[PDB]
Each structure stands twice: as structure tokens, then as C-alpha cells.
Design an enzyme around this catalytic site. Structure first.
Site, mmCIF file in Angstrom:
data_model
loop_
_atom_site.group_PDB
_atom_site.id
_atom_site.type_symbol
_atom_site.label_atom_id
_atom_site.label_comp_id
_atom_site.label_asym_id
_atom_site.label_seq_id
_atom_site.Cartn_x
_atom_site.Cartn_y
_atom_site.Cartn_z
ATOM 1 N N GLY A 11 -41.936 -6.844 9.870
ATOM 2 C CA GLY A 11 -41.191 -7.546 10.892
ATOM 3 C C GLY A 11 -40.467 -8.759 10.360
ATOM 4 N N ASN A 105 -50.319 -15.212 15.395
ATOM 5 C CA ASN A 105 -50.464 -16.393 16.228
ATOM 6 C C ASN A 105 -51.636 -16.224 17.188
ATOM 7 O OD1 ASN A 105 -48.447 -17.970 15.161
ATOM 8 N ND2 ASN A 105 -46.941 -17.517 16.765
ATOM 9 N N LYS A 184 -52.537 -25.224 17.268
ATOM 10 C CA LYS A 184 -51.315 -24.495 17.589
ATOM 11 C C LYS A 184 -51.449 -23.755 18.914
ATOM 12 C CE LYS A 184 -48.052 -21.208 15.512
ATOM 13 N NZ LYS A 184 -47.813 -20.289 14.365
HETATM 14 N N1 LIG Z 1 -40.765 -17.058 12.954
HETATM 15 C C1 LIG Z 1 -41.683 -16.020 13.352
HETATM 16 O O1 LIG Z 1 -41.281 -14.922 13.505
HETATM 17 C C2 LIG Z 1 -43.161 -16.332 13.553
HETATM 18 C C3 LIG Z 1 -43.564 -17.609 13.438
HETATM 19 C C4 LIG Z 1 -44.867 -17.915 13.604
HETATM 20 C C5 LIG Z 1 -45.789 -16.928 13.889
HETATM 21 N N2 LIG Z 1 -45.385 -15.647 14.013
HETATM 22 C C6 LIG Z 1 -46.349 -14.631 14.335
HETATM 23 O O2 LIG Z 1 -46.254 -13.433 13.245
HETATM 24 C C7 LIG Z 1 -46.534 -12.314 13.858
HETATM 25 C C8 LIG Z 1 -45.339 -11.339 13.780
HETATM 26 O O3 LIG Z 1 -44.271 -11.972 14.427
HETATM 27 P P1 LIG Z 1 -42.816 -11.239 14.309
HETATM 28 O O4 LIG Z 1 -41.681 -12.057 14.856
HETATM 29 O O5 LIG Z 1 -42.523 -11.079 12.849
HETATM 30 O O6 LIG Z 1 -42.953 -9.784 15.076
HETATM 31 P P2 LIG Z 1 -42.036 -8.460 14.749
HETATM 32 O O7 LIG Z 1 -41.965 -7.565 15.955
HETATM 33 O O8 LIG Z 1 -40.642 -8.931 14.468
HETATM 34 O O9 LIG Z 1 -42.684 -7.657 13.464
HETATM 35 C C9 LIG Z 1 -43.741 -6.753 13.690
HETATM 36 C C10 LIG Z 1 -43.731 -5.605 12.684
HETATM 37 O O10 LIG Z 1 -45.186 -4.930 12.492
HETATM 38 C C11 LIG Z 1 -45.115 -3.654 12.782
HETATM 39 N N3 LIG Z 1 -46.246 -3.244 13.625
HETATM 40 C C12 LIG Z 1 -46.866 -3.470 14.773
HETATM 41 N N4 LIG Z 1 -47.901 -2.653 14.858
HETATM 42 C C13 LIG Z 1 -47.903 -1.911 13.740
HETATM 43 C C14 LIG Z 1 -48.760 -0.926 13.344
HETATM 44 N N5 LIG Z 1 -49.860 -0.545 14.173
HETATM 45 N N6 LIG Z 1 -48.604 -0.293 12.188
HETATM 46 C C15 LIG Z 1 -47.558 -0.652 11.397
HETATM 47 N N7 LIG Z 1 -46.704 -1.633 11.787
HETATM 48 C C16 LIG Z 1 -46.875 -2.264 12.956
HETATM 49 C C17 LIG Z 1 -43.869 -3.591 13.697
HETATM 50 O O11 LIG Z 1 -43.216 -2.422 13.596
HETATM 51 C C18 LIG Z 1 -42.930 -4.694 13.169
HETATM 52 O O12 LIG Z 1 -42.033 -4.219 12.068
HETATM 53 C C19 LIG Z 1 -46.687 -12.664 15.350
HETATM 54 O O13 LIG Z 1 -48.001 -12.686 15.690
HETATM 55 C C20 LIG Z 1 -46.104 -14.078 15.491
HETATM 56 O O14 LIG Z 1 -46.751 -14.844 16.597
HETATM 57 C C21 LIG Z 1 -44.081 -15.325 13.844
HETATM 58 C C1 LIG Z 2 -45.889 -22.926 20.528
HETATM 59 C C2 LIG Z 2 -44.588 -23.709 20.460
HETATM 60 C C3 LIG Z 2 -44.753 -24.960 21.313
HETATM 61 C C4 LIG Z 2 -44.330 -24.183 19.044
HETATM 62 O O1 LIG Z 2 -43.159 -24.963 19.024
HETATM 63 C C5 LIG Z 2 -43.363 -22.916 20.923
HETATM 64 O O2 LIG Z 2 -42.651 -23.451 21.704
HETATM 65 C C6 LIG Z 2 -42.991 -21.509 20.417
HETATM 66 O O3 LIG Z 2 -43.820 -20.782 19.827
HETATM 67 O O4 LIG Z 2 -41.831 -21.052 20.584
#
Ligand SMILES: NC(=O)c1ccc[n+]([C@@H]2O[C@H](COP(=O)([O-])OP(=O)(O)OC[C@H]3O[C@@H](n4cnc5c(N)ncnc54)[C@H](O)[C@@H]3O)[C@@H](O)[C@H]2O)c1
Ligand SMILES: CC(C)(CO)C(=O)C(=O)O
Length: 305
Positions: A11, A105, A184
Site C-alpha cells: 500500500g 495504526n 497516538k
Molecule cells: N501516510 C500513511 O499512509 C500512514 C501513516 C501512518 C499510519 N498508517 C497506517 O499504515 C497502515 C496502512 O495504511 P495505508 O495508507 O498504506 O493503506 P493502503 O490501503 O493504502 O495499503 C494496504 C495494502 O495491504 C494490502 N492488504 C490488506 N490486506 C491484505 C491481505 N490480507 N493480504 C495481502 N495484502 C493485503 C492491500 O492490498 C494494500 O495494498 C494503516 O494501518 C495506517 O493507519 C499509514
Molecule cells: C490522528 C491525527 C490527529 C494525527 O494528526 C489525524 O488527524 C489523522 O490521522 O489524520
């Protein structure tokens, strides 16, 4: 030469980590969901990372969960509601020495992942790096951030941290990682649920000063009763600080609902309410907040969990 970095969940963050790890010379292998995803990825040629408008192709090796070699180090980078199912798809490939980096998260999935993979080490991650998908196998490095790593059981830091340093992945080891994830989470509960219920950017919560304080009030009791007096003390000022700093953004949960996708409510506000009831701690305003947000989700055909 050393350990392959197996990446499960290609992802936003998973591709960002895979790009920086593989481009820094480290062995990296994307675990794609199925062979159809695999032969699409090979038609694409690799991961496309967009940095300040500049796109770069990273021809990282990839595979499916059934083939491949043993997995000694795995970066789980899917949503929290998919972590348990994702890790199980490769349980037949874990090695016993295997370590898992849980880029989820909230809380709940990490414990549930560790419960189903007992012969493996599950390390907890907390990241503030911004990344979003712009099509399959294309991710924009939106904002720089930091990733806290830590194991509540095994508090000694692994020696492969400096590999992340070589890859330009900013990180700090934390001995009390649970204190980090709880900070967080509490920040998420005070901000995100009201942004969805009020359809406002994070700066719109200034128009709700009393309601923000009473949630931080109850979220303050929850952290204090959980052993984190420091987090409970700075909580309100930390909430007010993040608001003005992100006043122009829509929250992640507001963006999930806007796109008609599932939220991580079951590992954020739902988990916090679950933990409060487990602590025998009456948290009524978080309870009504959880009720209004679940009904708001169901109203749109979205999962309330
Ligand atoms: N900037 C960010 O994107 C960010 C920041 C902080 C925390 N997070 C956390 O990271 C985690 C992912 O966030 P994201 O934006 O990248 O989500 P996303 O949807 O963009 O990526 C998820 C990927 O994992 C794969 N997935 C889900 N289940 C699967 C499975 N059973 N088998 C194989 N692949 C599987 C999906 O196909 C997808 O490609 C989340 O929990 C998010 O809260 C993301
Ligand atoms: C949890 C928090 C407050 C972090 O900025 C948020 O707003 C987000 O995840 O988009």
C-alpha cells in the site's frame, strides 16, 4: 549479505518502505495478494514513487504468499482490520526466528497478530510519514515523518535498525512502545471522530472547544489509569497543538469516509472504549461519541467496526 525484507501489504507505507529499503541495496521482496496482482505488477515494471512531483521506478522483486523462501523478517503494512488475516496468509512461511514489523495504526491488530503467530516476534510501529496511493503500484511520498519501533516483551533493540538508517527511514527505538501507540491513539480519538461527524477539516474543531476538552478529559482518565500519567497530562495541549498544525487537512478517517472505505474505528475509538470498559472506567462521552460515529458509518453503508 543478510536478511531479505519481505513486504506484505503493498500500500502507501508498504511501497514507501519497500522503495527506500530496496533502493539502498537491501534485499527486499514484495508479497502480493495473488498471482493476478503479481503479473500486473510485472506488467508495470515495479513500484513508482513520486517525490515532489518526480516519479521514479523501483523494479523490486515480488511474489505471492504461497511461493518463495522462508520469511525471517516481515514488514506488515496493511490496515489494522486486515493485519490478522494478512499475517495468517504467510504463517506457513515464518521461520521461528522471524520478526514482524507491524505498521498498523491504533491497537488491537498487533495483539491479535501476535496471538496467532506465537513462534514469531511482533514489533510495534508508530509512524507519522505521509503517503497515499495514486493508482496501483504508484505512491506519492507526501510528507516526511518518524517511525517509533519497540517490542513490549523483548525491549532490546535489534541490530538491523542501522539498515533502516542506511535506507533513510527515520526511526527511534522505544523501550515503552505501548506508551507511544497510546499517545497516538488518544490524539486520534479526540480529533478524528468529530471531524467525520462535523464534516470539517481539523481546523474546524476550534469551533468546538468545550466538546474537545471533555473528550480529552475522559481520554485523560483512560491514559492515567493505563499507566501513562505523562501522556494524560500533556494530552489536551498536545491535541490543541496538532489541531492548529493540521488545521487545513482533512483527517485520515474523514478521508476514509469520503472515499466510501472502511475506517480503523475498531482499533482507535472502539479500542479505547473497549479498554475503558475493561478497566472498569466509565467513559460516557467517548461512549456516545462512539455511538454517533458508528451510526454515521452505517448510515452510509460503511462498516461500523
Ligand atoms: N501516510 C500513511 O499512509 C500512514 C501513516 C501512518 C499510519 N498508517 C497506517 O499504515 C497502515 C496502512 O495504511 P495505508 O495508507 O498504506 O493503506 P493502503 O490501503 O493504502 O495499503 C494496504 C495494502 O495491504 C494490502 N492488504 C490488506 N490486506 C491484505 C491481505 N490480507 N493480504 C495481502 N495484502 C493485503 C492491500 O492490498 C494494500 O495494498 C494503516 O494501518 C495506517 O493507519 C499509514
Ligand atoms: C490522528 C491525527 C490527529 C494525527 O494528526 C489525524 O488527524 C489523522 O490521522 O489524520
Amino acid at each position: 549479505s543478510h536478511m531479505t525484507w519481505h513486504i506484505l501489504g503493498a500500500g502507501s507505507l508498504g511501497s514507501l518502505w519497500a522503495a527506500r529499503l530496496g533502493r539502498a541495496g537491501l534485499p527486499v521482496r514484495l508479497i502480493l495478494r495473488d498471482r493476478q496482482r503479481l503479473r500486473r505488477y510485472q506488467q508495470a515494471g515495479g513500484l513508482s514513487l513520486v517525490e515532489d512531483g518526480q516519479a521514479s521506478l523501483y523494479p523490486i522483486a515480488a511474489e505471492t504468499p504461497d511461493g518463495g523462501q522462508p520469511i525471517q523478517r516481515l514488514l506488515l503494512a496493511c490496515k489494522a482490520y486486515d493485519a490478522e488475516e494478512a499475517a495468517s496468509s504467510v504463517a506457513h512461511r515464518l521461520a521461528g526466528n522471524a520478526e514482524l514489523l507491524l505498521l498498523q495504526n491504533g491497537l488491537g491488530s498487533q495483539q491479535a497478530v501476535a496471538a496467532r503467530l506465537p513462534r514469531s516476534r511482533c514489533l510495534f510501529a508508530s509512524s507519522t510519514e505521509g503517503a497515499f496511493r495514486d493508482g496501483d503500484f504508484r505512491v506519492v511520498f507526501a510528507g516526511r515523518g518518524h517511525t517509533w519501533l519497540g517490542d513490549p516483551r523483548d525491549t532490546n533493540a535489534p541490530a538491523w535498525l542501522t539498515q533502516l538508517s542506511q535506507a533513510g527511514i527515520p526511526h527511534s527505538w522505544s523501550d515503552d512502545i505501548l506508551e507511544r501507540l497510546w499517545r497516538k491513539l488518544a490524539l486520534n480519538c479526540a480529533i478524528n471522530p468529530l471531524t467525520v461527524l462535523h464534516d470539517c477539516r481539523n481546523g474546524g474543531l476550534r469551533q468546538h472547544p468545550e466538546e474537545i476538552a471533555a473528550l480529552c478529559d475522559e481520554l485523560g482518565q483512560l491514559l492515567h489509569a493505563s499507566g501513562y500519567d505523562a501522556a494524560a497530562r500533556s494530552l489536551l495541549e498536545d491535541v490543541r497543538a496538532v489541531i492548529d498544525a493540521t488545521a487545513a487537512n482533512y483527517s485520515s478517517m474523514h478521508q476514509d469516509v469520503t472515499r466510501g472505505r472502511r475506517t480503523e474505528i475498531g482499533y482507535l475509538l472502539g479500542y479505547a472504549c473497549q479498554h475503558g470498559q475493561r478497566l472498569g472506567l466509565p467513559l460516557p462521552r467517548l461512549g456516545t461519541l462512539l455511538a454517533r460515529l458508528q451510526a454515521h458509518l452505517r448510515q452510509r453503508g460503511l462498516p461500523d467496526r
